[PDB]
């Protein structure tokens, strides 16, 4: 209960007595951990952005990265790097658009490689994670392009470059689950599975329509790489399990996170990202609210937890504030990162009690993606 | 003011996120940076493409397609936000979807976002 | 009046006196079982139509008349934007202006002159009766007369509410009578969110009270010369359709290329397709234009032939700000659009589309 | 009465009943006029910034220019050009620094030119208007270097080029009085003349000095170029108005802003822009307020105006906010332009009543400098 | 939170604005993004120039020079924003001046404004202040 | 005890019969009236000075003794930083191990050996009781202990307030005693603000009890040979001088070049500068430190020759970090230096300011 800038004032305090010494210099960020968040304001469309770097347990930024229009980042769930795909202009917002991948050092944050989109092809959007895509193994990262149509965009983080683009079917998203291939999730209501070589027609195979065409998939599902589980919520709450972890689509059941009284009484999930997954607790974490059906990228003050495989509810928290994306940090007792746009606040939860724990403010403009490492 | 409640158009003010026409947009309104309701502010490039909705007059009890457009090269107003999501559809369904920047086919391949138009193309069926 | 004057135009409309050998009248052209276009087989297929001399052949395609009554008369808006008229490169003023042409067209219904369109009138004592209770006594005397009162009667003719009935099922659909299926709404929502919208919807915004899927506007698209059509028209190997620039009084070397929009109504039926019947089928008129914006090399090529697409008659002048959209249309997006465009023609002509579907 | 989104609500219910179609299209701002004010917001240090042109009459954002890092914006007295100093990198806020002079048509607001800067040679530091600078014939366009030592870059607006650094003594800002010289404010207390031809060592020539080393001249002078008037408070309100419209320096009686006893009762000057000064009418803009004499950037809320011929004050405004930055339309009956950096709001005053006519909010993160043209 | 009031140095929270040291400060607090008190954030670089004040530390009535410096490179952190000026003097008296982008001397030329740290110099002397 | 000791220091130090020919003590180039530098004029003019033997000349300027007592021994600290000893190239650990150097040179005192070194010391009855009261008896019969113990003497003596009086006007005013002219607070300020303070200053941050104006590292500041006082070295126009890399076991390349940050105590009286003596003016000194921040055509010529400075010594390991500082001193702030640097004169050599 001593604040931070309060331990701060008295152990400088104590160094001027002391006649103590010290090198002005540039800090490195501490060693990458299971309670690093990282939160990205894509700013409300602005055509630079920041990334904070937070480390969760002393609710402290820990370090920032810039970034410019709407960049997709990703963080290595390993620990070893972050990166992100970014767009700028030569004259702000306007003039030669420059698409490139930067990968950053995650200690000191220094950039260790910058590579050039070619054609500026990134889809610009706002920011879904799982438009922008780390493989498994960390050497390709994946971009997803709408213009002129949907592709996607490979490129080699080892030999720091742009490889291609690969045609797709009219599908949206990329969840890697290999070093050469992804799922995407199709207009017509299958996931299309995409298996791509150096050059060549990319291996494209659909599953059955796992959804009626009146079931409204949102943009935010929640995937764990490393578990391959593909959570995803539709408008009404009814949450599609998909398991992509024997490298082809298993459907598994569904499950409401809402009940039919509560549903009967307006509750709906929404927000930005809705959704979060803990992959050792298998537990999924929606954030819900009574609203009306078009107020789906709302705030919610509630989460639900329930058991991925039996739907069974576990919790039902009230977060206290107006909150719009969650995730949750994959150790054991868990931290629920509670992001609020409107406040421009992490609440850091204890995702067991659901109680508020400390909570870092600040963070840019209109902050909506929190990304979490899964390094365990 | 609640923002969960059911979103309740209005036919006179134009700058509010509650103006009728805006039951789909994601962004600022154009208006409030020196453009219209449905012309983009000089100096940024207005795009073809556009995402759609059925909008609520309730002026005249019909309901309208207003098909957004973006007004682009800009870096975003910063005035008058609003996000409405009026039979907004996930991303796949991309004619509905309102978090993709719509810049497409604005001069000068501008793709930042500025602010948005909303004019009417049709009637809703 | 109005009824008589139409009832007049109904007459001459389907009259072969009024070719040179007695072998055509506008409904051989504008056969009403094809709405108003033309069934016949020439040397270049459909895309151009064979006149009265039985060997002639035009050098563009004949449109449909549904409709065509509700072209303004041609004019230059404040945009600098010409609009309107008939015709595809606008040189008629409107259909009045238009009416009197394929008579006196050696390549169409080919009389000599006015004189001998009105000695034809003459001979049918229906038509001196008809066109003196309209226009007054001897006015079948008078070849300038004669010719003029024709033309407005075949002008009112196409103003009937038979050549634009508004009763194709998107009609019905914006009166709440029936409701389209899933792919037409999808193809009416691409239509009216992508670049078509652009050109074929009668205004930039708001709601048309009669639409008919045109600005009326004069755009080059660059479409390439149909090599048949043109050896059959015999206009020559060096001639380039100059488009809205032909138009007399228009001198404008930025309308080189350009063609009035064409309303979409009944464009199911009335294949084949643009200024020059280039392409047969409606699905290629749609592909064609994914030449602008597909990276795909398939874009760049005409499904009918296997080749690319051909250099544009007019290099100059294209609508690359309306075609260059940045978004390709995927097959199921042009599949909605075949879907929605057939909605648009009219319930007579609805048995036309089962062969084409 | 009725808002402007409001007329603009009933204009277009009105064309949609009357079947009104119109163009979508790209608008072209309202001629420049006496009372359109642009504000610059340096966004407190961000790395991109916007300038918003505002017709003060109706109270209007008729649009915007994005800028880079502290741009210095320039506005052409007679309205027809404006121009900043602006500075990119290639990464955002690292990488290569460009800076530039770029030209834009006032109601296309389109670059007309776009002239790099060698040797990244631009002053970088709270936005002071005069540390760039336009002649009076608008064909030159000089901007502050302070590193490696205070120098004068001129920037030839006509033909579009870069021309040459003027090395100069230890002097800062920069007062352009002709095609070819103006004056600066130099450490040692004196104003410096520069003249420079097109080749060699420009000739400076210093006046007096004409102020003790102990009194304080704040960074934001008023300066009328069609005046030739330089308006300098000090920190204790104190005023030197220096008259340059002879070629020469002639010194003005200096004038007291704060009476005596005010100053006794801890009354001084204080904001950013805290001073203005309306040609026309020979008189003098103030914001001031009491406070302690190292609280000399805080918002004042309260607005002394005075004769630059005696001092005598005319009137004291209670703004009714916290106002960091004032300015003035140069037409009669001009505006008073209240700025406030932590509204981000420009309160539209009458100058003669000091009632607060109508006010535009939003503008950016921490708008701070106003600029009008005077163009009559 | 009377801005106008006379600054009150408190030797108890440097996030704060009134943190002794922070008295002529102009920007962000570097520990506020990252940094410490004397230490720039990670990925900016530190400057080696400086503007000084002579700051009053509450907790022992010694006078301190702080020689503020600038980590810069990185777009302003947005946190701890805070703008002190105690015997800050204007731009022509650029060694005492804080609105100063004071990034020279900073690795690869970055002279992009992020964040200030507040290490001491020496004791005091000055005459202005 | 240390006084004594320090006694027995005086003596020797004032004593030229640790010199070969009798004719030079350390006094005589450690001049007490010229804050213990060499106020003779030799070939090189006050560049370097002459031994006992009246030709052979240093290549190196005489440093001033005074404060040389507070450098820490030399070490490498934990940052890699090589930091104190003696002598400008650090090759000495402490003023214990510096003393008996000189009294060995040949190109100084050129004393044979330690024990021509003891038999000095036995010729001289009052050290005979010096010596023995602190080192005991027998002590000048063996060589090595009376040359270690002569250098004990000096090195107490060196160590003693009147080499570090701390009585300058800058002492005074740190002390609030007296206050510094508007000019001298302007070069305290810029002092500390600008480069110099990353150099010449004890710390990094926080005060020093004892401040001497050096952080006792060393630096290859890219300084010119001294022509002339290189010809009368007699070293050749073919030798480097590669600063601290010459003492025994340095051996990183990147300290090539490397010197000693010199206290800036009596600075202003300890002409010429720099290791070579190169610069006689305290101006010039200061100015050489703008050719690498200004761009104007007179940063390259040193202004005593009227010609370009001249390429470095050793082209490589400069502190480019921080001497490309961006800033150029102008002449006001060049002024304001020399009136700063002036107050870090002791009391006792105020009177030599002119
Ligand atoms: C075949 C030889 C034809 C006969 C007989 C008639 N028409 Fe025709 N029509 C024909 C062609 C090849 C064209 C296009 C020619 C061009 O230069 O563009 C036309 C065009 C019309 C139009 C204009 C329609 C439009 O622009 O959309 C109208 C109104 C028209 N035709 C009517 C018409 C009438 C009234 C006829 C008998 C008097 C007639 N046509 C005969 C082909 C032929
Ligand atoms: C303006 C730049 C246009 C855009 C965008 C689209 N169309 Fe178009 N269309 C245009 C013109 C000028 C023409 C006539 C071209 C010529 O010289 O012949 C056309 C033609 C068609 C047709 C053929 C109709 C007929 O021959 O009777 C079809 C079926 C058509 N256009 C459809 C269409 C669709 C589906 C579009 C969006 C994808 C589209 N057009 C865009 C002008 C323009
Ligand atoms: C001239 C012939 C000299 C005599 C006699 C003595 N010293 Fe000296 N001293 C001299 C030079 C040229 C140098 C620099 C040598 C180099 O290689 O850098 C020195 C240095 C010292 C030092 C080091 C001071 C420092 O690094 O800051 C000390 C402590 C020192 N000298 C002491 C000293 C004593 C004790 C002497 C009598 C035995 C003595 N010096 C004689 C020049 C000459
Ligand atoms: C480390 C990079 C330094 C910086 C920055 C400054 N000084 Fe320095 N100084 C330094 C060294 C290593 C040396 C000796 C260089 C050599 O090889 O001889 C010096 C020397 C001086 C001197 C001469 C002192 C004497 O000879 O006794 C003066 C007057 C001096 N330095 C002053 C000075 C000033 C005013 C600075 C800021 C402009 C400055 N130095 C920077 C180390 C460094
Ligand atoms: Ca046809
Ligand atoms: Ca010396
Ligand atoms: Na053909
Ligand atoms: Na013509």
Redesign the interface.
């Known amino acids: 209960q001593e604040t931070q800038g309060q331990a701060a004032a008295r152990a400088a305090a104590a160094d001027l007595a002391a006649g103590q010494d010290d090198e002005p210099r540039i800090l490195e960020a501490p060693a990458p951990d299971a309670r690093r968040v990282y939160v990205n304001d894509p700013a409300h469309f602005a055509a630079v952005t920041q990334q904070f770097v937070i480390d969760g347990e002393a609710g402290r930024v820990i370090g920032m990265i810039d970034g410019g229009f709407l960049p997709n980042p990703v963080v290595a769930d390993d620990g070893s790097f972050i990166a992100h795909a970014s767009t700028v202009f030569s004259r702000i917002a306007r003039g030669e658009r420059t698409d490139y991948v930067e990968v950053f050092d995650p200690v000191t944050l220094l950039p260790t490689a910058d590579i050039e989109l070619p054609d500026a092809p990134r889809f610009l959007v706002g920011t879904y994670p799982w438009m922008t895509s780390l493989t498994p193994d960390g050497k390709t990262l994946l971009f997803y392009q709408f213009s002129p149509a949907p592709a996607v965009g490979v490129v080699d983080l080892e030999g720091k470059a742009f490889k291609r683009m690969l045609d797709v079917p009219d599908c949206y998203h990329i969840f890697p689950t290999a070093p050469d291939t992804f799922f995407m999730h199709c207009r017509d209501g299958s996931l299309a599975k995409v298996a791509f070589g150096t050059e060549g027609t990319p291996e494209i195979t659909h599953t059955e329509v796992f959804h009626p065409e009146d079931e409204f998939l949102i943009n935010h599902p929640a995937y764990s790489q490393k578990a391959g589980r593909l959570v995803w919520p539709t408008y009404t709450g009814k949450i599609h399990q998909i398991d992509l972890s024997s490298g082809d689509a298993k459907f598994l059941p569904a499950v409401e996170a809402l009940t039919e009284a509560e549903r009967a009484d307006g509750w709906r999930p929404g927000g930005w990202q809705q959704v979060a997954y803990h992959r050792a607790l298998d537990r999924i974490y929606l954030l819900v609210d009574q609203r009306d059906e078009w107020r789906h990228k709302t705030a919610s003050r509630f989460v639900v937890v329930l058991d991925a495989k039996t739907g069974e509810r576990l919790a039902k928290f009230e977060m206290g504030h107006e909150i719009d994306s969650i995730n949750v940090s994959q150790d054991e007792k868990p931290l629920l990162y509670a992001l609020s746009t409107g406040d421009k606040t992490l609440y850091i939860h204890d995702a067991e009690s659901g109680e508020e724990l400390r909570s870092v403010n600040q963070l840019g403009h209109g902050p909506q993606v929190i990304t979490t490492a899964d390094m365990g | 003011t609640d923002?969960?409640?059911?979103?309740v158009p209005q036919?006179?003010?134009?700058?509010?996120c509650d103006?009728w026409?805006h039951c789909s947009i994601?962004?600022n309104i154009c208006?409030?940076?020196?453009?219209?309701?449905?012309?983009?502010?000089?100096?940024?490039?207005?795009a073809?493409?556009?995402?759609?909705a059925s909008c609520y007059?309730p002026?005249?009890g019909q309901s309208?397609?207003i098909?957004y457009?973006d007004?682009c090269?800009?870096?975003?107003?910063?005035?008058?936000?609003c996000?409405?999501?009026?039979?907004?559809?996930?991303?796949?369904?991309?004619?509905?979807?309102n978090?993709?920047?719509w810049?497409?086919?604005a001069?000068?391949?501008?793709?930042?976002?500025?602010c948005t138009?909303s004019?009417?193309?049709?009637?809703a069926? | 009046a109005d009824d008589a004057l139409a009832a007049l135009g109904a007459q001459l409309f389907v009259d072969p006196a009024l070719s040179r050998n007695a072998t055509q009248s506008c409904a051989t052209c504008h056969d009403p079982a094809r709405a108003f276009t033309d069934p016949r087989e020439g040397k270049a297929g459909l895309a151009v139509s064979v006149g009265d001399d039985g060997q002639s052949h035009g050098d563009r395609n004949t449109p449909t008349l549904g409709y065509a009554a509700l072209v303004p008369a041609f004019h230059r808006d404040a945009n600098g934007k010409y609009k309107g008229g008939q015709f595809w490169d606008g040189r008629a003023d409107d259909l009045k202006q238009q009416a009197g042409q394929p008579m006196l067209n050696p390549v169409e219904m080919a009389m000599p002159d006015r004189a001998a369109v009105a000695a034809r009138l003459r001979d049918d004592p229906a038509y001196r009766t008809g066109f003196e209770a309209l226009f007054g006594k001897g006015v079948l005397d008078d070849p300038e007369r004669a010719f003029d009162a024709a033309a407005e009667a075949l002008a009112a003719y196409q103003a009937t509410g038979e050549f634009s009935p508004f009763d194709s099922k998107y009609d019905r659909v914006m009166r709440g009578e029936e409701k389209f299926t899933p792919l037409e709404e999808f193809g009416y929502t691409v239509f009216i969110t992508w670049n078509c919208r652009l050109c074929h919807m009668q205004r930039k915004q708001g709601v048309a009270e009669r639409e008919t899927f045109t600005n009326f506007e004069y755009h080059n698209i660059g479409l390439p010369v149909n090599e048949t059509a043109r050896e059959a028209s015999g206009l020559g190997a060096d001639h380039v359709d100059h488009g809205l620039l032909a138009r007399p009084g228009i001198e404008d070397p930025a309308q080189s290329g350009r063609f009035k929009v064409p309303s979409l109504r009944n464009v199911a039926v009335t294949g084949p397709y643009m200024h020059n019947g280039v392409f047969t089928d409606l699905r290629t008129a749609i592909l064609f234009y994914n030449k602008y914006t597909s990276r795909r090399p398939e874009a760049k090529i005409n499904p009918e032939t296997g080749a690319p697409w051909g250099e544009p008659e007019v290099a100059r002048n294209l609508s690359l700000a309306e075609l260059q959209s940045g978004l390709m249309l995927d097959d199921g997006r042009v599949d909605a659009l075949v879907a929605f465009l057939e909605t648009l023609t009219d319930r007579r002509y609805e048995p036309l589309l089962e062969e084409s579907r």
Chains 1, 4 share one sequence.
């Open positions: 923002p969960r409640a059911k979103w036919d006179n003010d134009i700058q509010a103006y026409r994601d962004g208006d409030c940076s020196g453009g219209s309701l449905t012309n983009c502010p000089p100096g940024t490039k207005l073809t493409a556009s995402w759609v007059n002026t005249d309208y397609l098909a457009r007004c090269g800009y870096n975003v107003s910063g005035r008058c936000p996000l409405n999501t009026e039979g907004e559809l996930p991303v796949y369904r991309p004619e509905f979807a978090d993709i920047i810049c497409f086919g001069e000068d391949d501008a793709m930042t976002y500025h138009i004019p009417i193309v049709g009637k069926s």
